[PDB]
Amino acid sequence: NLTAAESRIRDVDMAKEMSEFTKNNILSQASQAMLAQANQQPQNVLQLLR
C-alpha cells in the first residue's frame, strides 16, 4: 500500500505525457514555421518598397 502511495505521488500518466509531449513538439515546430514567416514578410516588404 505504501509503494502504491508513493506511486500515486510519482504517478506518470505515461499516455498523457506522451500525448502532451507530442503536442509540444507540434507546437514548437509550428511556432518556428511562423518565425520563418516573420522573417519572410519584411523581405517581401524590402522588394516591394525598393
Partner: protein, 49 residues
C-alpha cells in the same frame, strides 16, 4: 519597420514549447511525475518520507 518585426510573441511561445516538451521527456524518461525541483515540495517531501 522591417527590422523590428520578428513575431517575438511566437519566439516566446517557442521557448515555452521547447521547455514544455523537454519537461515531458524528463518525466517520461525518468518515469517521474515528481519534479527534481522543489515545485510541489510538499508531495516530494512526502514521497521522500
Amino acid at each position: 519597420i522591417n527590422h523590428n518585426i520578428a513575431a517575438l510573441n511566437t519566439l516566446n511561445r517557442l521557448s515555452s514549447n521547447n521547455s514544455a516538451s523537454q519537461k515531458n521527456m524528463e518525466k517520461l524518461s525518468s518515469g517521474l511525475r515528481i519534479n527534481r525541483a522543489g515545485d510541489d515540495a510538499a508531495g516530494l517531501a512526502i514521497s521522500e518520507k
